[PDB]
Design an enzyme around this catalytic site. Structure first.
Site, PDB file in Angstrom:
ATOM      1  N   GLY A 109       0.849  -1.605  -0.191  1.00 14.27           N
ATOM      2  CA  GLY A 109      -0.040   0.083  -0.060  1.00 14.27           C
ATOM      3  C   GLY A 109       0.747   1.432  -0.273  1.00 14.27           C
ATOM      4  N   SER A 110       0.149   2.674  -0.539  1.00 15.35           N
ATOM      5  CA  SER A 110       0.992   3.609   0.378  1.00 15.35           C
ATOM      6  C   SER A 110       1.873   4.245   1.036  1.00 15.35           C
ATOM      7  CB  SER A 110      -0.554   4.758  -0.083  1.00 15.35           C
ATOM      8  OG  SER A 110      -1.410   4.272   0.036  1.00 15.35           O
ATOM      9  N   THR A 111       1.823   3.474   2.014  1.00 16.63           N
ATOM     10  CA  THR A 111       2.990   3.079   3.189  1.00 16.63           C
ATOM     11  C   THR A 111       4.270   3.246   1.902  1.00 16.63           C
ATOM     12  OG1 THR A 111       1.819   2.230   5.162  1.00 16.63           O
ATOM     13  CG2 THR A 111       4.560   2.235   4.782  1.00 16.63           C
ATOM     14  N   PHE A 112       3.955   2.858   1.000  1.00 13.25           N
ATOM     15  CA  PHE A 112       5.730   2.708   0.270  1.00 13.25           C
ATOM     16  C   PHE A 112       6.213   2.905   0.023  1.00 13.25           C
ATOM     17  CE2 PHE A 112       8.124   0.593  -3.456  1.00 13.25           C
ATOM     18  CZ  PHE A 112       8.895  -0.849  -2.382  1.00 13.25           C
ATOM     19  N   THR A 134      -3.279   2.847   1.655  1.00 13.11           N
ATOM     20  CA  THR A 134      -3.970   2.375   1.138  1.00 13.11           C
ATOM     21  C   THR A 134      -3.644   1.336   0.128  1.00 13.11           C
ATOM     22  OG1 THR A 134      -4.689   3.694   0.001  1.00 13.11           O
ATOM     23  CG2 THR A 134      -5.886   3.738   2.095  1.00 13.11           C
TER      24      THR A 134
END
Lengths: 640, 641
Positions: free
Chosen positions: B384-387, B583
């Site tokens: 997800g967007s954490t990456f 997300t």
């Protein structure tokens, strides 16, 4: 729901109580004639369910869908479907709607006549006016019937005319002795339900004439299935029996009473032979009026089946076995017409369909010679007649030449000491043996020796042109014929024995006559045929013409030469090419078991008839060729 | 030639298979009788010696070796085989047997003598029993609090037909479930199970404390069994044990004939150390009792204890915070890689998996679509967007991303051209002018995908290959190496741009996510996670540069501290935090449209003492991992300082 858990059960068990005919359990679980709705009294189902189902004999009531909801504080209602089978055919479908009663466990159904039939006003009678269809005949080549209907003698008793006491018991004895019955069968044929001493209760059905008549006995005419050849054709034709609930369960299209085939062609062609009976239920309302009757039928007679069987040849083939175990098949080999399929010993089909005691049914089942078996449809080792086939294969592949002369000394031969005790046996000690000598004297050592040269590949390549493994298009069960239990022999003993028809070959007489008809068709194999209007099917070049023109003259000499193993048939003065055969079944629990005798014979001048005859577990000087004459004379007088 | 010795072959095979299954009837069912050149005893006097020595040692798994059948006479034979056998005390390896056959009626017969069963004795002796069982060792937490232990338990259950019949039967269920904090359909469910019926005791519940007076049908049983203090909260990691199957001893011949064996999780992974070796003196003797030599002799040794890095209270806190939803949560101390928590929800009760199996319920919640048997902390997902923080870190290292660069992004969706069709990268907040720090605060996927396309695929992969993609971690947990993509090349601008913000064919499990994200607490060093407390710390230096860390981490605090940060709710905790939300929508070039996942990564940037990542599959909005985060965070902040 625990409160109405006995609501689904106490309707389906009532429906099965009507299925098995115990109507008093059904008409024994109602409250009263209470005003919901009317309904009908507790004891006024006396003539109901009995006089309406006596002429109907209805069985097979099944539901297959039950789900009961609630209507009131004391009312749970039905709305589901059911079906059944009465004397007039199939009645699908039925819609059932009924009400329950609120009690302490006694889940009483409030039946009113809507629950029998989907609409019934009340207090009314019916009218059947039935008409009974006839079962189709089974005819021979010339229309002589092998299974038809005849006028039979229905034997019975009325209990009041037997008297009372020791005079009555003496009359019971006199009946049992005269009708060939037991005392106990008579005593509880009478002492049962639905009996009152002026009722005519049946006991037996006879095809022959009327026996002695003691006081109380009673005769009636009855129409039934008859078998004019009876025992001589029993295994082929079979017999019919009464309809049971289990056959209704397998095919609900059937009637409730009537006849159904239980073996042979009567079971094989049951749908064509049966037809449908005529008549309607016709619910009146005690004045002549009709309401309407939903599901009903018309009359339609069963169809006839015409066979290739020659009835007189069938009887001559059966009688010639003399009550001993064996089988005989005769054909017209150019066509494949099965002229006779005799299997011995046999049972009496008329007594099996007219009421046979358990005494005699087990006596037929206890008989170690097994008279219920269709031996013309049972796989056997063909015996040393099969030498004709391997000789024919050997002349085809160039491995057997008629000029080859083997030197064989003695009666016994094995390949080496590795064979142990086993050795191929022959009857005549002939030093110099070529193929014609081998065929005349039935020399097994020659062919087994000439099967090991020309090994398994050449041999099985010749055998694969025949019908091994094929399902023949005949209305008979008939396992396919096998060469051996596996794809390869894996031993020289088995190969050698296969060479003269022993070993693990399984060929029934019918497919045995199929394989042997190449000698009457110049190498073409003609398939057997039982239904007289099926067209002929052959299979060409199974063996070569030159093999046929080499072998058949030697098979003539099997009859004509004084050293021939079928020389006795020379006395009949008819043209014959024949092959005799032995087979030694060891039955590996003791040593030196039973031996079967075989005879293959046909007319080589016109090819109009062929016979294969097996005599199983022969005794001394008894052979299939000793039993063959009367059939042979018949066949060449009438098949030219 | 002859096939008599093939019948002797099949007879020896059926004799061995009759000894292995335990039916001593058929093992003595094809023997001779008492004679001088035949079997040494009668039929009832051979079954008597097996059931008190072979049945006493629970002898299972006779594996046959080099079976020779030959022929010395015409009526007698000679067979001599090797074998191996499994006993209660373990396994004997090399032993030689022989014997003589018999011929009566085509079927062959074995002439028995008491050294075909033991290779040195002759007869007139008994041996029993001399075993000394060992205890399975414990699986302990970081501080010695046990997570798997063996001891005495009290469990409740019911037994038919002492439940009764009619309504009086269901009258007993109304009294049991009322008194033992249970329901009624579960009691009807466990009796409606498979063939086990009726006099078997079917378990219901583990009973703590004193036993009340029991109603009819209730049954209390005391068992020395395997217990799991945390239950479902660590079921995936710890696993459960079961009874040793003949299949289990076919796959490992060194196992004892009975005992318990791990069937999932750490109990399978550590089964050899967790079990021990039984002790005993199975020997050979005479009728009196004196012995000549021995067969098996071992000093008993109980299983060893295995101390983990897991914190029992953090593990329970992490599992309860998921609230039964599908999800995962991993917590570490990033400087050392100690795995503090490995939570996967939903889960199963491991105590019922040991105390019975409940076959009908086994299939019930193994075809649960939430599939609670899956260890989600070892299951590869799109991160997800954490990456984005990884993509940014690679960009500031290779120069392709500068913090002062401002992109102009209008709208909520973006594609490069219309060759992308209907696909568009989506953002949540419509901010016109967005730098790197704005894009981390608002979680702007469109900035990152744009900057990923401007960076090369080679520039991007070169940074990614300094991480642990394709590496097998040295963990006693089954897992696949994490992947960048299905192929060595993306061969798609869509796939590459989506990989830039954590979607695509990128597969990384939460333990691997914790390993990659540890660079931000170790100045670019990646610290490998460890699960066993005594293992040495393993690191990998300069995965990213420390200026990238000093750029990104100040922005991760503002993800919490700024009113527009996507984790600003965590600012109410009053604890020092650096965080990144994420997300992942389940739709890509080669899959099916599914749901949305809600990731959270957070740690303390002041002392680098703890780190967490949580996933929360199938978000079902009004919910996020940031919403479920705070209680595990307050615990970690107070206890890892």
């Amino acid at each position: 729901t625990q409160a109405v858990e006995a609501g689904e059960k106490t309707v389906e068990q009532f429906v099965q109580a009507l299925n098995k005919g115990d109507y008093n359990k059904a008409a024994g679980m109602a409250s009263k004639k209470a005003a919901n709705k009317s309904a009908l009294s507790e004891k006024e189902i006396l003539e109901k369910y009995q006089n309406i189902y006596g002429a109907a004999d209805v069985k097979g009531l099944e539901i297959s869908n039950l789900k009961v909801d609630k209507k009131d504080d004391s009312t749970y209602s039905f709305s589901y479907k059911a079906k059944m089978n009465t004397s007039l055919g199939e009645l699908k479908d039925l819609s059932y709607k009924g009400t329950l009663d609120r009690n302490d466990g006694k889940t009483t159904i409030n039946w009113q006549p809507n629950l029998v039939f989907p609409e019934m006003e009340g207090n009314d009678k019916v009218s059947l006016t039935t008409q009974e269809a006839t079962r189709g005949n089974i005819l021979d080549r010339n229309g002589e019937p092998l299974a038809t209907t005849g006028k039979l003698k229905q034997l019975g008793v009325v209990p009041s005319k037997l008297g009372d006491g020791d005079e009555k018991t003496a009359n019971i004895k006199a009946i049992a002795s005269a009708f060939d019955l037991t005392e106990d069968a008579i005593n509880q044929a009478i002492s049962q339900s639905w009996v009152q001493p002026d009722y005519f209760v049946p006991l037996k059905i006879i095809d022959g004439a009327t026996p002695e008549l003691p006081a109380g006995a009673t005769i009636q005419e009855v129409d039934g299935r008859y078998y004019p050849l009876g025992e001589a054709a029993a295994q082929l034709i079979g017999y019919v029996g009464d309809i049971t609930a289990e056959d209704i369960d397998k095919n609900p299209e059937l009637s409730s009473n009537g006849k159904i085939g239980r073996s042979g062609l009567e079971m094989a062609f049951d749908k064509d032979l049966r037809g449908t009976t005529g008549g309607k239920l016709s619910i009146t309302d005690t004045d002549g009026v009709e309401k309407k009757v939903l599901i009903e039928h018309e009359v339609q007679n069963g169809k006839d089946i015409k066979l290739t069987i020659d009835a007189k040849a069938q009887k001559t083939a059966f009688d010639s076995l003399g009550g001993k175990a064996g089988s005989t098949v005769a054909t017209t080999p150019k066509t494949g017409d099965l002229l006779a399929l005799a299997s011995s010993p046999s049972y009496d089909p008329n007594k099996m369909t007219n009421g046979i005691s358990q005494e005699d049914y087990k006596a037929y089942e206890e008989n170690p010679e097994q008279p219920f078996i269709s031996r013309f449809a049972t796989g056997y080792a063909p015996g040393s007649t099969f030498k004709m086939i391997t000789a024919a294969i050997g002349l085809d592949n160039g491995t057997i030449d008629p000029n080859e002369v083997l030197t064989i000394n003695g009666l016994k031969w094995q390949k080496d000491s590795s064979w142990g005790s086993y050795q191929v046996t022959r009857v005549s000690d002939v030093s110099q043996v070529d193929l014609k000598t081998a065929l005349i004297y039935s020399d097994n050592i020659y062919m087994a020796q000439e099967t090991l040269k020309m090994g398994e590949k050449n041999f099985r390549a010749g055998l694969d042109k025949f019908i091994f493994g094929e399902d023949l298009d005949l209305p008979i069960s008939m396992n396919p014929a096998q060469i051996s239990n596996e794809e390869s022999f894996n031993s020289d003993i088995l190969l050698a024995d296969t060479g003269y028809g022993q070993g693990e070959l399984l060929i029934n007489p019918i497919q045995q006559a199929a394989m042997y008809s190449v000698f009457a068709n110049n190498g073409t194999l003609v398939y057997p045929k039982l239904i007289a209007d099926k067209e002929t099917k052959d299979k060409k070049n199974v063996i070569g013409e030159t093999a046929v023109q080499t072998i058949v003259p030697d098979l003539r000499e099997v009859v004509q030469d004084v050293n021939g193993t079928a020389h006795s048939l020379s006395a009949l003065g008819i043209p014959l090419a024949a092959k005799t055969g032995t087979a030694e079944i060891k039955e590996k629990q003791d040593e030196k078991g039973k031996e079967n005798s075989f005879l293959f014979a046909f007319n080589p001048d016109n090819q109009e008839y062929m016979m294969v005859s097996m005599l199983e577990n022969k005794e001394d000087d008894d052979s299939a060729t000793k039993r063959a004459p009367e059939l042979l004379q018949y066949l060449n007088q009438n098949y030219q």
